[PDB]
């Protein structure tokens, strides 16, 4: 009768170089999972009314990221939810050129 319970540590803030691959982790203890990215539009991740630009990416839970680019970095979030509610932990990805 609760919101889903997630492993506290993950996802962890990851730093990667461009052209390399990235793996983000999520661990559910229990309940569907979908990852999200926070979209930055004109230097603002928030819209007109004050809602965030957030996009669903997929549906231990790993997310494969191959050949990361500059637009691939930002905030990633793991959404777990059930009949009662939701729980989410966010991490930030960093892309570095060569």
């Amino acid at each position: 009768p609760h919101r889903p319970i997630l492993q506290a540590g993950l996802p962890a803030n990851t730093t990667a170089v461009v052209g390399s691959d990235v793996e983000l982790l999520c661990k559910v203890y229990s309940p569907h999972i979908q990852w999200l990215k926070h979209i930055v539009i004109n230097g603002s991740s928030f819209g007109a009314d004050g809602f965030p630009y957030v996009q669903v990416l997929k549906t231990v839970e790993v997310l494969y990221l191959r050949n990361v680019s500059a637009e691939d970095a930002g905030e990633y979030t793991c959404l777990a939810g059930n009949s009662i509610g939701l729980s989410y932990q966010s991490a930030w990805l960093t892309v570095l050129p060569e």
């Binding site: 009314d49 809602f51 939810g81």
Partner: protein, 61 residues
């Protein structure tokens, strides 16, 4: 605070309604109804980030 409680109330009321409707087209109408109400409640950055996060998860149903 008290607004955050009405959000979870709308979510659970919408979760129950979504997952008890066999008509896949009527399920989208229930999301849109919860979409407008949820956007009509939240006022803070975390509350608006919550009301958004919910909306995408009812679509996973």
């Amino acid at each position: 605070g008290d607004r955050r409680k009405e959000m979870d109330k709308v979510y659970r009321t919408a979760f129950k309604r979504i997952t008890s409707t066999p008509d896949k087209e009527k399920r989208k109408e229930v999301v849109k109804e919860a979409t407008e109400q949820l956007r009509r409640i939240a006022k803070d950055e975390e509350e608006k980030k919550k009301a958004a996060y919910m909306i995408l998860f009812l679509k996973t149903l």
